[model samples]
Structure formats: C-alpha cells, structure tokens
Target chain A: SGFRKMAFPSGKVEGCMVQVTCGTTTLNGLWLDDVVYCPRHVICTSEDMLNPNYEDLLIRKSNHNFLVQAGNVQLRVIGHSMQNCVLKLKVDTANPKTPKYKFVRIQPGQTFSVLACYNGSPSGVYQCAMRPNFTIKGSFLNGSCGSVGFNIDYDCVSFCYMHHMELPTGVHAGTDLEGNFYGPFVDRQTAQAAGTDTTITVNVLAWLYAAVINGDRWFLNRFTTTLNDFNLVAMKYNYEPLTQDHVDILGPLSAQTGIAVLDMCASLKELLQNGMNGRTILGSALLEDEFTPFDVVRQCSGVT
Target chain B: SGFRKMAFPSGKVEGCMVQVTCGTTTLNGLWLDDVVYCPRHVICTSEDMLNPNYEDLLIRKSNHNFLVQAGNVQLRVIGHSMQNCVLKLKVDTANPKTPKYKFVRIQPGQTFSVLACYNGSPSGVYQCAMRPNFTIKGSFLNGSCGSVGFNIDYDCVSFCYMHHMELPTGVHAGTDLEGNFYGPFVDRQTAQAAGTDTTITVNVLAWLYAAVINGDRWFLNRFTTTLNDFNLVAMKYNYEPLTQDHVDILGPLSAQTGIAVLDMCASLKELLQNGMNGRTILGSALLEDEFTPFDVVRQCSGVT
Candidate 1:
C-alpha cells in the first residue's frame, strides 16, 4: 500500500490541530474546519508579561570600571499621592534562586534613591516588582502583583573636569608673570589623575582683579582649599584680562581645581562686605590657591 | 481747725479715703488699687483688652493707596480642631451693637485674601472675630477657643507692558526690522497701551514664511489666512540670490496669494542624470538678460 502527504493553503481554519515549539518542547493544537494552524508559545519571557498594568522602568550601563560615577544613571518619578508603594529590583531571569532581587518600601510624600550597589549584580536586565497589601474579609493579604522591566548596558561613567587660569598682569596690584600668584594649581590632567581624590586650588584674587566676578561659591568650594582663602584673595582684585594662552592653561586648570574663579570673586566680595575676615577669609583663599597679595601683605604687616 | 493734704509715696496710710485720677476717670485710692492691682481683675482686664500680636498680624501698606492687605491668616484651637471657621470684621471695640462688619467663612485648606477697603467712609482700625463649629459632650466638650491674626499688606496696582520686541529676534522673527525681511512692526505707543484693545495688521506672506522657516506657528495662526497661500507665493519667486530685498516682497505676496510659480528649468535639471539632452549635445546657448552664462551652462551640463 502507498501513503500520500497532504498540504494546506494559507488561510484561517476553525477547530484545527496545531503544533507549537519553544526551545526543546513542542505543543500540539486541534483543528476546526478544513484549515490547520500552529499554536504559539511564549519564548524569552520578561516579568512584565505577567503583570498587565506596569509602568516605567529604567536600566543603565557604564564603560569605565568605577563603583560610583557622576550622572551615570538617573530615574525621575512624578505624580501626587504615592502612598505605601514598594519597589523591587531583580537581575538575571535564568536563575530563580539567585540573590539578585531587592524590595524597597516607600512612604507617602517621600522619594527614594537607588544606588548602583543596591541591585545585586551589574550588567543585566533588572525586573522591579511592586507589591501592595490588600485587605479581604477582615484579613490582610500580601504581595498584590505589579512589575516593570529595565535593561543595563556596560558604559556608566561620567566625564567632567575642572578648569583654572592665571590672573592677567596690570589688572591687580600683585600678580605673577603667569597671571597666577599662587602655585600647585589643578588642571585637566591633574584632575583626571587625582579623580575624586584630591582638592583643587585656584587664585580668586587674580580672578576678581581680572574683571571676572559672579556668585558661584559651590564651584569655588569644590576646587579651593578653603573659603577664607578665596575671600582674602578676591578682595584686592577686579577686571583682569583673559588672554588666549591664559585661557588655554586656565580652562582645564579651573576645571581640575573645581574652583570657578569668576564665581569665587563674587562670593568673596559679598563676604568682605558682610564683615568676614581672618580665618574665614583665609580658609576659602587657601582652598582655591595657597597664596595671594593679601597673605604677603598680612605677613609683612605682622603686628604680633 | 486746719485740714492738711499730706501725700505719701506708696499711698495714703490708715482709713482716710484718698482720691486719684485714672486718665479721664476718677476713683478712690482703695478702689483704684483693687481695680489695678488685684490679680483676678488684672487677668480678666488683660483678656478684655485688645492686644494685637505683631507676628500673627503681618501687615503691608500699599505704595499708592496706603491701604493694608493681609494673607495666610491662621487660627489654632486649644482643645478641638476648628471646623468651618468664619471671621467677622469689626470697626468699633467700645460698642458691640455697631454693625460695621462683614462675615467671611474659611473652608478647609483655604486661606482668606483680605483687603481692608480704605476707600470706604471713615477709615479705622478693624477687629476680625473668628469662630468655629464643633460638637460638645457631657464631659468631653468639643469647644474650640483660639486667637486669630492676619497676614496683611497694602493694596497697590502696578502697571507695566511686555513689548513683543523684548523677545529675541531669533525667537520672535517678525517683530523687528533687523530680523524681519521688510519691516519693524509697530508696538504700543506707551506701556499703558500694551494691554489695551489695539490691533495691528502684519503682512501675511512675510508672517507665514517666518512662521514655517523659523518654527513659529503661533504668529501665523493669528492671521485669517492659511499656509497654502504662503507656500504658493514662495514657490512663485526664485530665491537665486537669497537676498533680503527679494524675500521681503515675495514673502508678503506669497502670504496673500495661494498660487506659486514652478521653475521648469530647475526642476528638469534635478530630474535629468547625464549632460546630454537625448542627444550628444556639446553645449547649450544662454539668452541675454534671462540667464547668467555660467549658471545656464552649469545647469545644462549637470555641473553644480
């Protein structure tokens, strides 16, 4: 006896036996009319598939190998009335028993910040599960389900540097040929080499005398050795010229030092008007730059 | 017999009655001491006297009207929460029957925007009576007693106009002659005229071109015409030089008319691939005044 193979046309058929395969496993379907169809199977499924009403989830990656980097990852949540909410982080869906998940409970009128280490492992998909406590018939039930998905890549480093420069000559009473009366200043190379380890120094007095002034204490504080030092340096200088060569050296130096010269000048001027002197003035000045004309004047004027 | 009037520093000793004047009122020394010195009477009188708390009553006077204004008034209850609080404005403290007052109710989370109308008849200091509704029980009485104060300021009107030219030419393209192809649009004669009902008609073609090219659809929408007319006008003119003079006239004309001229020569050159025009054409002739020799030859030979 001879057997013949059968073929069907590409059209919808009701009540037909169909076969579906996922990896090594296969599933068979039933047929309705004359047409045959195959059943579909879910493959490489995410936790989001289980929850219908999940919203936003974010994951990030970094190139440089550092525990913490600036502006590498960020998540912003907005909306009023976030009450009794929970956030969970999970990594690597293949292993069920792995310790890659964490749960965090958030209160009303409060915000939560998640650090890189808070997630169990780096460089993988992170699944967030949100469970809310529900009450039924005078009994409390835990783990009402909701989930969100995010992916992490391998580049998570922030690139930033400080800039510095020397004060121009003829702008202030006392300034060096290099425009800076202070030494051991920070620049791009030094800032990068030091990373977040070292404090930067700048010459605020030189900066102010060069006609650069502004209220940028935060920038000054980052690079300057002390606030008092910055104040003392800024009091005696204003309207210094900024040259191409000076800017070329100073731009990266200012960045490396983390003391914005223009901002420091403005802050120092304000502090002097407010009657701040001595150590308070010296401290800020020391941080941005070690020496200024005021220091030399004070040393020469020694009453002690 | 001689009647001598002897004065003692503290008070008249013994049972002899002495008379004293209390401002405009006169009273015996014993009665005066009882009225002023008794702790019970002092406490009761202190409560009866109108003493205003400067901190609670934050008052500001208007520069123009000299009238006081108040905001962010608060009332704290002692034993119970003040629900549905109401304040009654009063003018006279001596007489309780005088009805120179108006009542205002404060809802939950709602503060009063109180303005003392100094323009009214006989301006005087006014007292505001605050009251609340609460339930009282046999032992646990829900009675609320609290003092009320106001955040006050004087009412004054400030007038200023925000001229459209104040916006940068890069953003508000058609406002000034520097940015516009043809005109510096007229603004209000004075700051006071800015908010008044004054209308100015701007050229439609110029407005539409500016709107499309500069990404400012808001100004285009103000006119009654559509963008189709503006597009047609732009198509009619050849922007060979892209000069401001040509653009000014053409842009306005295009804005008013919906028809545009299609340049067959430019369009045909873009569509053709080779230098030959269906034959081994060596070169093309240029008409005087109609086309530039270089441009015509370049276009004909497929050279930019």
Candidate 2:
C-alpha cells in the first residue's frame, strides 16, 4: 500500500490528548494532543512539537473554559456557510438519555443565542456535544464535533463569596438558581443563618432568576449581587435585561452579549461563566470609568 | 387604482424618528421627521385601540436630544424577521469614492456590531461611505447623519496618561477609553494638560483594535500610555478573535461589529471573506480551566 490509513480510528478521545502519525503527517502535542481534530480519515496523538500542526492551540479547548457556571451556560454558534443553513448541538453530551439534538438554523454573518446545561450531576464526565457546526475546539472540525465539558468543581464555589454585606440583604424564598441564594450571603454567618446553605440546593447563579427575569430594579436594589448595593433609589429599573437567562425568552433565541463592546458591561455575568470563558460576563473592569468627567459644568451665564 | 398596499413591506427604522399621517395616522414631535416609514398601502399606526407595529419602542419613542460628537458616528437599521436576512451600510456617509456597500445579513431579534468612519479628512464633514450598509446623517441625510459623532475630539484627549496604580488608574494614549484618561491625573496637572485641549479628531474605535486583541498578560508590561503599571500578573492571552480592526480596512464594506447572540467571535473570517468569516480558528471555553489560578493542599493536626 502506497499510503497509510488511520491507526486510532475508532477511538475518539476528547477533553484529553492522543498521538498520531500517518507516516510523515505527524501531529505532536504538549499532552492534550486532541487539539485541531481529525476528519473521518485521521486522528489524535500526544507528543510535544517544535512545529505541531496547531501552532497556537491551547491545552484545554472550549468546554473546559470560563463562562461556564453550575446549572446554565449562555451560548452561541457560528455557521460557516453563507447560505442560510442548519447546525446542531447536544447540550449535554453525557446524558444522551434526554432526547434529540438542538438543531439550530443560521445565516451568513448571523449570531444567535442557544442553551446548554449540565444534568447537575456527573461523577466522571458531565458533558455536551455539537455536530456539523464548527467549534473552536482550539480550531477546524468539519463533520461532527468534540465535546466541551464543565468544571465539575462548580460546587466548591464555597470560598468565592465569604464577606459582610449579604446577611443584611436576606433571602428570596422565591427559590431561584442555587448560586444566587448563596451569592446573596455575605459571610459564613449569613451562609449558615439563612440555613439555605443546607435547606436547599445552591447552584452558582443568582438565587433570584425569577426576579431577574422581571428585569426590574424593584427586587434588584434589595439583592446582594449583580447590582448588589443599598439603592433605595430604584429597585425596579433594569431598563435592559442584562443577565436575563436564555436570550430566547426575550422573544427569540440569540446572544445579547457584546454590550461590553459598547458599554462598560463586564464579561463576568457569572463567576462560573467566567471560570468557563476567557471573556468575563461579571468581573472587574480592566479600566474603570470616571475617565474625563467635568466636575463643574458651568453653563455660560449669558447662554442660560 | 386597484393596487394593493404595503403587505409587510421590508422596511424598519431604529435610533431616530419619522412622521407619517396618511389621513389620521399621526406622530408629531419637535419635528425632525422621518417619522414611521411607509409604503403606499394598508397602514398600521397608533390608534391605541388598534395595532402599532412597534411596542415599548424605547419607552414610547425617541430621546428628543442631542449628543453631537465630532469624528466618527454610529448608526443602524431595524428588522424583526426571525429567519436570516440581509442589510447594507454606508461606512462613511461623507466619502463615497473608493468602493461601497458594507452589506449586512442577519435574522429576527438580533443586534450586531456595524461600522462608521470619516472619509479621512474633513473641514466640515470628513466622512466615508459604505452604501446599503447604512448610516444615519443627523437622523436625516443632511450634511451629516443628524450629527451623532465620536470622540468629537480625541485630541481633547490632552495627554491620555496622567497616573499610576491605575486604580485611580486612567485611560489610553491610544484612548481616553477604559476611563476618560483624564480620570487619574491630579488637579493642577490636569488643568494644564487639558489647556492643551485643542480642537478635534475622533475616530473613536478600531484604533482600539490591535491592543485589545491579546487576552493573556503579555507585552502589556510596557505601554506607558496603556500597560503602564505592574500589579502585573500577565499580558496578551486571547483564545478568540471577535472583530478588532482599522475600520478603514473595509473600504465601504462595513459591519465589523458585535453579534453577541451566541458568541463574540464574529464570522469575521467569512463575514470578511464573505467580507470575512471562518470557524473561529481560536475561540469559547468548552471545558475551561480556572487559568491563572492556583490549587490548594490540606493541612494536619497539632502544630508540628
């Protein structure tokens, strides 16, 4: 035979590394060699290189990233075809027991928001999958796609918030995302006091998704996260739905991200989300604002 | 004439106002009328008792205000179609020489990043144009798009760098962005520096393209105007590429903006190759690690 065939053909190992060499077409890696991905023809390997096929591939790809929180994950997909096309996602790859693919349709230069979740339980691999759609699994996957997993440790978020402004804000028996419940707790005192830490399950989102869904400053000025300050001024005034879960609920499914591209919106929408994506939806400003402000706006007397 | 009227005609306007009164359909304002665009046919207007194509419409409609900046201006078009669609923009409404049309394509309920620019030089209107792509001239195709410009005077950027700690930390020589740059400087220093405030030249963005590109902490240790301090952890570490450009690079082909619907990584490769679009050669945290973070180890019994 003049040419060689695939060796680790059937064995598809993602979220980790593998090694391969179809004679001269070598693909070495720093370990997690499953970087670029292969066609139905070739595949994975783990052997660091001076000049690997992926020059700028990172160790862990997409799923194991920032922007992933405990329960929900805000999402989007890009279609490479300019002619209105269809793509699919398997939100939770491990729990294939649920149902079918989240078939998505898109156009050229179009962006949209989708949904992804964790069964909330996984001892080994709690995952999600996508097909036909191109994922930047660090890049270039054509046929189906590799899976992107979440940080199973999203539970150890215990130390993320242990301060002093929360116990006062109190709780939202309304029962929302687990994180929000605890997110409002200022210290270990508030944590145990609300008894919520033990009473119910606390994921790492706001405990007030229902209230947040209302997008008001009403219940807002009262919470201790997102706009967690003592603002008797206005609790019901989120003129814009900043972190309203599932952009689709707003009439359609699409990403309402990039406001950061406009306002001082942070990428750290959720600590987990940031722990998952490089871009933060909720975090500190790289460059905070009071930039060029006019302390005195003396309106010309004659003009006034 | 037995001619049918506007049957869901494909036209929408956002950002500005318009007036239309074919009999009783009236929308009166301070009178800068573009008021409700229409095509001759069955109409839909506010009867309150009936149908009004637009809802909430930014709290009843229009800001009836003026924030006329000097350099670059921003603009958009509106649509509610859920499927994929197309649009065009006028990158620089003032200059339409080289080539034209920054055509855009999108779907219903989507917001995107588009472009705007000055035709390079201007005594009065310094402008650029990308037909079909869209641009609003003072909200009317006047000598300007109703004068919604940029930086108005980035040169008003009298020394973008004025401090350290960057806490009170400030802006960029490259920008007053991050903060107005005037933010951190001491008073005496500021007053003098600002006296240096000349007339104007504000391209506002895109000049901001390159530097923002690097996500990791690298090379940033150097730029005094930008990376000035050393609370230093790192510089340059971007896992994705969401539109960072010269604004000038796209001749008349505008629309390099945010479509944060699902992801921030624009199909820039294709939207730009289409203008450009690609499979996010680098992007998303499918399985993100708390990069730049540390792990812990447990302790023992008595003080050894």
Candidate 3:
C-alpha cells in the first residue's frame, strides 16, 4: 500500500530583528555585542571564538579599543568589557566599504548588546584592539586589532540572537494569516521559555510598518523558519564536530538562547515530520557564503 | 581572501568487515539482528529463564525466526560441550486457514544440514524450536510434552552462529573495522582459564547477504551521517535537558568515529564564522526528505 499525505507547507516567512537589551542601560561605548543562540553545546578554542582578540584581551583582563565600519558610518571604541561579553547596536549605514561607527570602552559588569538594526549594513564583520583605546596618541591604525592581524569575521545575520522587545498594545511583530509573530527574535533562553516566562504580547510598531506597507511579514516569517530549520539540521547531523568552524558559529547562539545542545535533535525530528527539507540546505549554504562580506564590514570598523 | 582547496584523483576504495567471535557461551539472539549492534558487550537470556504463557510471553526471551518464500536454503545444527538437544524447524505457509508444517528435526549434537538442492514448498512464516531431547512429546495442542511453541509470524531471512565455516582468511567476526575478536559463547570461566580460545565464531550470514545485495551499507552510512548532523544542530541551539535517547544515539557513534558534540555556545561561534544566514529551514527540509525512506526501512526492521 502506498502512503499519501499533504505536503508540509513552505513559503516566504519573514523574521524581524528584535533589539537586544542588556540591563537598563542604553547601549553606549565599548561592550560585548549580542550573543547568538547555539543549541549544541561544544568546546571551542580561543582561536575558534568570535572576536578572538577581544576574548584574548578580555580573558587577560587587558584594556582594548578599536573602530568598526558598517556602511557609510564608522564606529570608534576605546575599550571593551573586562569580562567575557558581547555588545549590540546598529551602525548608521549599509556601505560595505565604509559605514557607521562607535567609540567603545570596556568596563566590568557592563552589559553587551548588539543592535538588531546593524544587520542591514553590508559589512557585518566587527573588530577590536588590544589597548584600552584605539587612539595611538593621535591617529588609529587602518587595521590592527584582531588576533589574526586581519579582522575576525562572523556571520552577521544568521548568528544574531533575537530578543523580545516591548511594544505598544495591539501591534506586534508582523503576523501572517495565522497570527504568529512573523520575524520576532527572542534570545534562546526566552525562545525556549516561551509560553512560560515570556509570552507573545503585541506586534511592534516596526512590524506593523513592515506588514502594512511592504507585506514584509512574509519574508520575516520565512527567515525565522529558515533559521529554525538550519539550527535543527546542524543539530540532527552532529555537524558541529565536523569542524571547529561549526562550533565557533553555533556556540554563542546556544548560550544566549538557553536551548540545550541536544534540542537540535528534537528540532530535526520535528522538521522531518513537518516536511521542512529544501530550506535547510539553503540556510546553511547562505551562511557559508556570507562569511567574507560580514568579515570585511567588521574589519573596516576595527572591531575584529 | 578566498580559501584554497585540493582535489584528488578518483580511484576505487575497498574495505572489509571485521571478524567477531563469541566471547561467552550464551549469545543474545536479538543482538544478532542487523538492527542492533552492541558497542561493548551484550547480555543473553536462556529459554527457561522466564515464564512462558501467552500473556507472560512478552517477558520471555525468544530468538527471532522467519521463513523465506524463495531462496536456496539449508539448515545446519552444530553443538559445543553438551551432547544432546532436540532441534525442529517448522514453517507456517500463507493463508492462515491452512495448517502449519514441521519441516526438519535433528537429534542431540547432530547436524541435520539441509542440502542446497532440497527445495521445500514456499511458506509464509517459519519457526525454529530447540530443546533437550529427553523431554520431547507434544501434540498440536494440550502441551502433552515439554514442547515450547516457537511460532513464526512472517517470512524473513535468517542466520545462526556457526562453529565452523571456511571464511576468507582475513575476515573474522566480533572485531571492528580494526581487527580484534574477544569471546566465549557459554562458559566464561573456561574461556577465561584457557586465555584465548578460538574454536567458535558467530556470523550473521543472512545480514551479510542483505548488506551486499540490498545496498544496506550505503543506507547505513547515510543514516549515520544524518543522525550525526541532527545532533550537531540540536547542540548548536542548546535545546536543553538532553535525553537518554539522544545520548545513546550520538555517544557511541561519536566515540567510535571520533566526532565531538558541541555545546550551544560553540555551535553559535561556528555558525557565525561559517556565514550562516537565517536560512536553516532549507537544510533541515532536505535532510528530512533524504532520511524518509531510510527511516521507514529502519522502523520496519525494528530499530527504535
């Protein structure tokens, strides 16, 4: 007997970038950017860690500073967190060559928050220096921050951990016909804790703008689903062990999300049952190909 | 800068299976099936060890038996140590309305080797029964003798632990891809005392046939890779509260293959460095599709 059933639906699900908040402080100065979510828990080398030089200086409790270029804007920072951390914020523009900028200072117990808006920048790579500040008495070096001498590169879009944002009532992150948040980004912990500590309260003003004007909700939903599917595939196949590169990409994501490394298996199982297949490869391949531009951006900013 | 790679010339690659010998006197019949492989050791149960009523049968240990609708077949009985045991090979032809048939029987330690040229009527299911010769007299019902009902439910290939066979010089059972055979089939004390006994070898000739003709090797390799990928994705996301099933599946495979499980943080690091955008869905969807048929076959073969 043959088995027949309706195929699992696939479409353009859009995901919205949610601003990550670190404590009550409005992100200013040198600090850690947002941590990505990784469900698979794995050991990583210092070289394997993103912003390796930042980590090295931070681990050594050294003072450091640098500049980061997103698009037309450039960010200059004097230092980063004394402890292991991440910072989040947006560069002013989207120029791959030269863009937005910021000046950062490292302090103890400082909250790291990577801005969700910065993802729009063509060069998503970030950089950092080994000194308290990138100021060399007068002028800053063109590119002398990352441990590798070159800017440390990273996958800017897929790796960012989405956080829940407070929005006005009624409006929400863009929604589809079924009313699910279209492109909402919640931290891994919050995502896993959804339905418990965190609940869908309202779609945001930004989402409404996207939904009504551009119907961007479709893209957001599709992106989120794609991200979910990618995470699930990486989990199911034990791809993390294939290379240290995989570990570097997924580690912070798992940590920020509070999702266990083992959850990938469950996610894979779910995806399999739901018939989510083609999209998984696209997600992974996209990540692999995007590394260069992301690194260049971060390097130009001197945040590598 | 782009990464460089090298390509190798194509050539034929060949490998051989490991030879394993029974380390103990009693072997667990279930372990012999292709569906199960013990990484370390296995525990076997004797026929009389458990109660055997239809309701209690669930707790009893019984070897899996199946008949072949068509095949060039033979049955050979060999014994070690003990002198007498009765063996009966029975078949239940299709069409439940008809009666079952007893096809072959042998006396204590005697080899009733079925010849290759002897063709029996095609049957639906078959059961093999073995017991001490002294207590053997039973009708179709009423339990007049100490006969135990070894009922066959379906036709499937079968194999047994053979004491002697002219195998290829290098191949041995009980070893891995590397050559290492450790065993004693019945008496551990005797085996241990003797230090290295090499008289008996256990081989699943039926499974070997299946592996060769059915392309089972390709299926198994793909299955393993997919399972590994699943584990990686889960770890990347930090799914939480790792389950026993996940551990069981990933642990041994990783250990044997030297693949490490990455935690969520590590996975994120890799994802970022790898340029993963939010397109994870496509990869997962493809994996699910690839695994569908394999999963079905595994399920049918009794793999959980």
Each candidate's TM vs. the true structure? 0.13, 0.16, 0.15
The candidate 2 chain A region of ten consecutive residues with least summed lDDT is A1-10
Best by TM-score: 2
Ranking of all predicted structures according to lDDT, beginning with the best and ending with the worst: 3, 1, 2
User: Distance from true position, residue B197, model 1, in Å?
Assistant: 20
Per-model C-alpha RMSD = 41.1, 29.9, 29.6
Q: Give the per-residue lDDT of model 1 (tens digit) for A1-304.
A: 0000000110111111122222332322111122111111111123433432312221221111111111232111121111112111111112221222222222111111111111111110111111111000000001101101111111111101000221111000100112221123321122211111111123334333221212222323323334444435433442223333433444543453354544444454554444333232211222222223222221122111
Residue B113 lDDT (model 1)? 15
Residues B130-240 of candidate 3 have per-residue lDDT tens digits of 112211111111100111111111221112211111112111122111112222222111212222211100011111122222222221221122334444543443322
Docking class of 3: incorrect
Q: What is the DockQ of each candidate?
A: 0.01, 0.01, 0.01
Q: Among all windows of ten consecutive residues in candidate 3 chain A, which has the lowest summed lDDT?
A: A5-14
Candidate 3, superposed: residue stretches over 4 Å from native: A1-56, A59-65, A82-304, B1-304
Ranking by TM-score: 2, 3, 1
Cα lDDT of all candidates, in order?
0.19, 0.17, 0.21
- For every model in order, the TM-score on chain A comes to 0.17, 0.18, 0.18
